[PDB]
Each structure stands twice: as structure tokens, then as C-alpha cells.
Amino acid sequence: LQLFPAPLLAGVTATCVALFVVGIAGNLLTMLVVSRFRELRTTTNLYLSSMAFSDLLIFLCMPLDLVRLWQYRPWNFGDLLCKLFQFVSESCTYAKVLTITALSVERYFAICFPLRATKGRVKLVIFVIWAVAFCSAGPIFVLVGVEHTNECRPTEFAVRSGLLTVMVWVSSIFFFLPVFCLTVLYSLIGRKLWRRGGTTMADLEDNWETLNDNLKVIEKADNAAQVKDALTKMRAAALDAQKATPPKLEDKSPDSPEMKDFRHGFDILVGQIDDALKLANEEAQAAAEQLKTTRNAYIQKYLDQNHKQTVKMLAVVVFAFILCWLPFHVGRYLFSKSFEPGSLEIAQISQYCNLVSFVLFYLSAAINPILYNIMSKKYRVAVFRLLGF
Amino acid sequence: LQLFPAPLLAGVTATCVALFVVGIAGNLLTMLVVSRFRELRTTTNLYLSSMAFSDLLIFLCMPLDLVRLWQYRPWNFGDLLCKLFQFVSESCTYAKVLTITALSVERYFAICFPLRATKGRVKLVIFVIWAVAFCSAGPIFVLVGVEHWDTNECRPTEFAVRSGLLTVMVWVSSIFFFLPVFCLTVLYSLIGRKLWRRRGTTMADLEDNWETLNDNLKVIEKADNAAQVKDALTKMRAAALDAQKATPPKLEDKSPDSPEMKDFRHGFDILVGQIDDALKLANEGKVKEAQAAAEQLKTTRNAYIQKYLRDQNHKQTVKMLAVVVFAFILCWLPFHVGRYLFSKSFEPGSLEIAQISQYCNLVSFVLFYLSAAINPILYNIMSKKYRVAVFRLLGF
Ligand SMILES: Cc1cc(-c2ccc3c(c2)CC[C@H]3N2CC3(CCN(C(=O)Cc4cn5cc(C)sc5n4)CC3)C2)ncn1
Ligand SMILES: Cc1cc(-c2ccc3c(c2)CC[C@H]3N2CC3(CCN(C(=O)Cc4cn5cc(C)sc5n4)CC3)C2)ncn1
Ligand SMILES: CCCCCCCC/C=C/CCCCCCCC(=O)OC[C@H](O)CO
Ligand SMILES: CCCCCCCC/C=C/CCCCCCCC(=O)OC[C@H](O)CO
Ligand SMILES: CCCCCCCC/C=C\CCCCCCCC(=O)OC[C@H](O)CO
């Protein structure tokens, strides 16, 4: 009994085809980047790659969604399709949710408890996630169907035995998990990142990242008569970088490495900067190269440094996930509260809500690589360098 | 090695997955539609269904083809995978050309030699087509391989190049390419020239009128209204006059004052009269009586006119086939032109050559899968009966 004009459906379908193409392309790019370069295979990235895979699966779901969208009369075998593919879609959703959770959890202990002490661990957790998600979505196979509107919805057997309400429990738990991750875990992350002794943990990262970028840019690019300003920035950043407290110290050491690390790093920065300043007024590039090796010889010795961009990008990611998934849940609750009353206009509202949930579903499947491209510079360079050497 | 951005290659890959979905769906639908709708089981439709098969077969190759495009060696039998699947692809391509040619030929004979002349025949012709294709693509199997700068495929081996077999296969490929060109250029242009040859109207016009008569006859089978049945009948009557003037194909080599044109031209005189009487029943609120009259129209039409004319849809058919064959040639053109230009070009191994060649191969790749997926689209755009049958099976 659908009330969507042909122009509206055509626009939805074209948008969805667009999302199909862009999302396949981008999630493929993400998975390839992770599998290609060794340094990018951090725990967080492996989880993201898992999610990229779930997104690809969702895109394979899309064609039958579009078919069902345009059908006036569903197929005889359609019931099975419904069951199977609803299961598929929701399995993926659950898996992605859990991956986010795992991810967030395993970043959380990575910052708030730096002191806590593996390969195959990540594979095991991914496998655990997929099995748990399959089991949690299992019931869908036996609770939704197509009965004598006329759509892939929960059957009456599901309604009149309570099983619908336990599946809504499961769905709501799964919805609140990423909300918990963004609101509670990411906020505790951000606390520890922006907590005071001379400066904060995030300011360490920015300063350290500012000093290296200036030196590395000039060492291999942007040749000019005077790069002393970059040398000045390096000195200032190195100066502030001493005021911070690296993670291995645990900020419980007033002077035992506070004297060791401050003296050693500041000394290497100091003397090299003074010699670089003299050559800058008048071999300067070689002095910068020599300064670099001491940094690697000391920075690697007592230090991830991407803790801030990682958390901020994960925040945007989890936010977009929850946004796209919110209208479904909200509409479901508000329309469950009024079932029989006013079944005329509320039906129109419900179909439009389901349509926006549809488009949002596939948008969520496509959006993460776009975010990565806009926010991660490392991601950009890795897609640039993907087919090289 | 790869001389274009990864985002381009990922986007091409996704586009190809889209063509995979659409092409599997469309060609499946073509085969189903022909197999179930019996008033769509023509000779040429059976040939098109054969083609739909070859296209499905092509789309199964696309997963491994994309793996090879990304230069992933997941296995060590790549060499074998190449000899096999390249063979597969060429065979399928050859099959289409031959089946195109086959149906073109038949359709040509049907129209230009109308005075001249079963379901086992088409089955045998398709069998023979597939045999000739498999043999003709056979040598691909033994002279392509994967063995030891700026290139990256499965490609002709040195044994192929330096024994002359590669040139023989380029000849074979070029002949196959030109067969559909011959079909479109020669056969279809002669067909259209006879189809639109004046004698009051043209043969193509008579087919439009016949087709409007048969369609409006189907309307009265289910019409419920005076104006509904009367509308159909009004359109028929204009059609019947304007078709009475035509010169039937079985009687093309006759005189305008023949005993056969009398019976033809008088047969429409009756058929107009029957329409007039069914109209006068419709005017007076006799809907079920006008439909009974309209059935006499069928039997009158059946006796006089079917004997004076087999297929009554040549014009629409050949327009569609021209679009199909043109699309085929266009998609296969860059491969052939590029191969020739790069053989003639004085310089191999240059980077600009390498980049040009890689881009040409990429667009040819996409074109190959586009040619495999586009036919059901064209049928849906052009044939209405086919589009309706597809929508019925899809539930639209
Ligand atoms: C021809 C036919 C097809 C089907 C059929 C029925 C259902 C579904 C599918 C096919 C594919 C996948 C599944 N389709 C996923 C889908 C539509 C969009 N969906 C929403 O809108 C709700 C939602 C979940 N979710 C998760 C996020 C993260 S964001 C977000 N929104 C989710 C369910 C339904 N049956 C009978 N015959
Ligand atoms: C993992 C692996 C895979 C393979 C392998 C090698 C080759 C091919 C395939 C797999 C699949 C099919 C075959 N692939 C078809 C193909 C690519 C696209 N091709 C073109 O672009 C040229 C063309 C023909 N043609 C006909 C038209 C009509 S339009 C048009 N274009 C045709 C050849 C090659 N080997 C080694 N390890
Ligand atoms: C919002 C950003 C837009 C960027 C990219 C937007 C377009 C992407 C794909 C277009 C091809 C899809 C083909 C059209 C898909 C729906 C077709 C349809 O439903 O019927 C229309 C038909 O053409 C009536 O004759
Ligand atoms: C060695 C290098 C040689 C390279 C040579 C490349 C030439 C390709 C040019 C083709 C344009 C010719 C236009 C032909 C248009 C025919 C369209 C057609 O017949 O189909 C339409 C259909 O019939 C509608 O009713
Ligand atoms: C070439 C034919 C292949 C068909 C399978 C393609 C695979 C993708 C499936 C669905 C895309 C969305 C369906 C596009 C909607 C087209 C239907 C349409 O626009 O026709 C209106 C009709 O009256 C309905 O009410």
C-alpha cells in the first residue's frame, strides 16, 4: 500500500547506488591500506578493518533492499529472503557495535592504565565478536517474516509470545553500547589526555608532532635560504616538551627520571639547536639530520604518539554511527507507544521514518572511509602510496 | 608499476561490482522471461537468451578478474588460472558474435527473402555456435601465461609471440570483431531499406498498424466501460483503414489489381465493418456484446490476413538489434584500436606509453563488463512486452 511518489523512490535509489559505489570503494581502500603497510597495523586499525568488512557485507545486502523497496507484490519465497537477509544485516550491525566496544575498551586501558601489560589476540576477539553477533541475531531468523504492511517485519508469533520484547532488549543493549563508549570511555580518555605537570599529555603530543614535522619537512623538502624559524619552533616545542610527563614515568616520579629524561632530551635539543642556529645565520641541514637520530634514539626509547587524533576521530566515527541508528530506535519506541490509535497519518509518518532509516543505514556503511580521509593524514598518504614500491 | 591512483582503481572495482549485480540480475531475468512467457519464445529471443547465458558466464569471471587487476597472487597456479579463464572469456565473446551473426542472418532472410521459407533447429545452431567458439578460442589456452617492468597482466607468452601464433590469433580476433560490424552495416541497413520502402505506406507502417490492432484487441478482453471499449475500437478503425493500403510481404512481387490484393484489401473492408458494428454496440451500453463482436474480428483477421503475412514485429526488433550490436562494437572498439596503435607505435617501454596503455586497458576492462550487463537494460528501454514481463517477475 506504499505512498511514495516515483520521483522520491528514484531519488532514494540513486542516492543509494551512489553510496554503494563510494562505500565499496572506500572500505576496500581501508582494508587494503591496513593489510599493506606494517606500521598501520595497530590494534585500533585492525578493528577498523573488521568494521570495513562488515560494511562491505551490508553493501551486498543493498540490492535486495532496493528490490523490496520497489515491490508492490512480494515473492513467494520472499519470506525466507526476509529472514535470512534481516539476520545478515543485523548480524553485521551487532558485529560492528561489538568491534567498536572492543576497540574502545582496548584503547581505554591503553591510556588510563598505561602500566597494564600479543598477536592472534586481535583475531580471537574479532572471531568472538562475529560468533556472538551471529548468536544475538540468530532469533531474527525465526522472529521476522512475511505473513498475509506485507513487509519484512516481526511476525505475529514473535509478538504474542514476548520474543519480540526480548529481541528489542537485545537491540537496545546493542544500541547503548556505543553510546556508553562515546560518552563514558572516550570522555575518560579525554580527561587523561587533558590533565595537568608543566603541560598536559595532549600538549606533549602536539609539541612533539610540531617539532618533528618542521624538521622532517625541511630535511627532505622546502629548501630555502632561511629555515631558522623552523629551528626556532623546534627549540620552543622541545622546550615545552620537557615540561610534560611521559607515560612510562606514570607521573609518580618527582625526580628520578624527571631529572634523567629532562636533562637527556633537553641537552640533545639544546646543543643541536644552538649549532643549527649558527649555521642558519651563515651544513645546517646536516646538523638537523644529526639531531634527528638522537630523537629516534631517545623518543623510541621512552615512548603510540597518535593518542589525540585517534580518540578524536573515533569520537566522530561513533557519533555518526549512533546518529544514523537513532531514528530507527526512536521511531520504533514512539510508534510502539501508539499502535491502533490514529492509524492514518501515523502510518505515513512511520513509512517516512523507515525510509530515512534505510538511507541512514547505507550511509553509515559508507561514511567511515570518508571520515578517515578527512581526518587522518596517515590514511591519505597510505592511499597515495598504496600501489607503489 | 600501477600508473593511476588507488582511489580510481577502487572506484572502478566498485563500479564493476555494481555491473556484476545488474548484469547477473538482468541476464537471469532475460532467461527466465523467455523460458516462462511463451509469446516471448521467438527464434531471436532464444538467441538473445543464449547470449544472456554467455554474459552470466562472463560475470562469474569478474571476481578473479578483479583479483588479477589488483595484482594479488593468492595462489601459485595463476598461470593456469590465466590459460583457463582467458580461454573462458574469449570463448564467451566469440559465442556472442556468432549468435549475433546467426540471429542477424536469420532475421535478414526473414525480411529480404520473405517468399523463401522448428525449435530443434535453434538448439542445434546454438550448439554449433558454442563448438566453433570453444575451438576458435582454444589456442588462447596454450599461448597466454604468467612468467617473468611497467606491465602487469596475464599476457601472450614468448612462445606465442615468436612462433607466429599470436599473429594468427590477432587475425582470428579481428575477424570475429568484424562479423558484427558486417551484421550492423550490411544486413541491418538492407533490412531497414526494405522495411521503409514506399508502395501509400511502408512495410514498417503496416507492422505498426497490425501491432496497434492486436494490442487494442487485448484491451477489449478486459475493458469494463463503454468509452473504454469504444476508445480501443476507435483506434483500431483508424489503424485498419491506414493498414488496408499496405502491400503485404507475401505478396510483394504482385500487381495492385491482383486476386490476392482484392482478398487482402476486401478483408480489411469486412474488418472495418465489424469494428463499426462493435462500436454501435458500445454506444448503446452493450459492453459484453461489443467484446463478443470483437472476437469475430479475430477470426476474420485470422483467415484473410495471416495467410497474406510470420513475424509482425520486424521494425522494433531490428531497431533494438541495431542498438545492441552498436553497443557491442563500441565496447569492443578500444581494445582493438589500442592494440593496433600500440603495435604500430615506434616506442615500447616508455612511461607515457605505459600509462596510456594502462588507462586503455582499464577502460576496456570496464567496457567488457558493461557489454555483459547492458543488453537487459536495452531490452527494458526498448521492448515494452519484455519490460512488462520483467516487472511482473520482479513484482512491480
Ligand atoms: C526482496 C526481499 C528482500 C527482503 C529483505 C528484507 C530485509 C533486508 C534485506 C532484504 C537486506 C537487508 C535487510 N535490510 C537491512 C534493513 C533495511 C534498513 N534498516 C534500517 O533502516 C534499520 C537500521 C539498522 N541499523 C543499523 C545501523 C548501524 S543504522 C540502522 N538502521 C535495517 C534493515 C533491512 N525481504 C524480502 N524480500
Ligand atoms: C587470479 C588470476 C586471474 C587470471 C585471469 C586472467 C584473465 C581473465 C580472468 C582471470 C577472468 C577473465 C579474463 N579476463 C577477461 C579479460 C579481462 C577484460 N577484457 C578486455 O578488456 C578486452 C575486451 C574484450 N571484449 C569483448 C567485448 C564485447 S568488449 C571487450 N573488451 C577481456 C579479458 C581477462 N589470471 C591469473 N590469475
Ligand atoms: C547525491 C550525490 C549524487 C552523486 C551521484 C548520484 C547518481 C549516482 C548514480 C547514478 C546512476 C544510477 C541510475 C539511476 C538509479 C535509479 C533509476 C530509476 O529508478 O529509474 C530512473 C529511470 O531512469 C527513469 O526512466
Ligand atoms: C585504426 C583506427 C580506426 C578507428 C576507427 C574508429 C571509428 C569509430 C566511429 C564510429 C562512429 C560512426 C557512427 C555510427 C553510428 C551508427 C549507429 C547505429 O546504427 O545504431 C543506432 C540505432 O540504429 C538507432 O536506431
Ligand atoms: C537490468 C534490470 C535488472 C534489475 C535488477 C537490478 C539489480 C538492482 C535491483 C534493484 C535496483 C532498484 C530497482 C530500480 C527500480 C526500477 C523500477 C522502476 O523504476 O519501474 C517502476 C515500476 O513501475 C515499479 O513500480
Author numbering:
A (entry chain B): 35 to 151, 156 to 186, 195 to 242, 1001 to 1086, 1091 to 1111, 255 to 340
B (entry chain A): 35 to 151, 156 to 186, 193 to 243, 1002 to 1111, 254 to 340
From the primary publication:
To describe the molecular mechanism of the ghrelin receptor in binding with PF-05190457, the initial construct of the ghrelin receptor was truncated by eliminating the first N-terminal 34 amino acid residues and the C-terminus after residue 342. To facilitate crystallization, a thermostabilized apocytochrome bRIL was fused to the third intracellular loop (ICL3). In the resolved crystal structure, the PF-05190457-bound ghrelin receptor is packed in a P21 monoclinic lattice with two complex molecules per asymmetric unit. Whereas PF-05190457 adopts an extended conformation, the arm-1 ((6-methylpyrimidin-4-yl)-2,3-dihydro-1 H-inden-1-yl moiety) of the ligand projects into the cleft between TM2 and TM3 and is covered by ECL1 and ECL2 regions, making van der Waals contacts and hydrophobic interactions with R1022.63, Q1203.29, and F1193.28 as well as disulfide-bound C1163.25 and C198ECL2. The diazaspiro core (2,7-diazaspiro nonan-7-yl moiety) of PF-05190457 is adopted in cavity I, forming direct interactions with D992.60 and S3087.38 by hydrogen bonding. Arm-2 (2-methylimidazo moiety) penetrates deeply into the helical core of the receptor, and it packs against the side chains of residues F2796.51, W2766.48, and F3127.42 in TM6 and TM7, opening another hydrophobic pocket defined as cavity IV. Notably, the side chain of W2766.48 rotates nearly 180° and tilts ~3 Å toward the extracellular end, and together with the side chain of F2796.51, it also displays upward movement, therefore pushing out the extracellular end of TM6 and enlarging the ligand-binding pocket, subsequently impeding the formation of a salt bridge by dragging R2836.55 away from E1243.33. Through structural comparison with ghrelin-bound, the PF-05190457-bound complex structure shows breaking of the salt bridge between R2836.55 and E1243.33, breaking of the weak polar interaction between R1022.63 and Q1203.29, and newly established polar interactions between the inverse agonist and residues S3087.38 and D992.60. In addition, the binding of the antagonist occupies the orthosteric site and maintains the conformation of the E-R motif and WFF cluster.
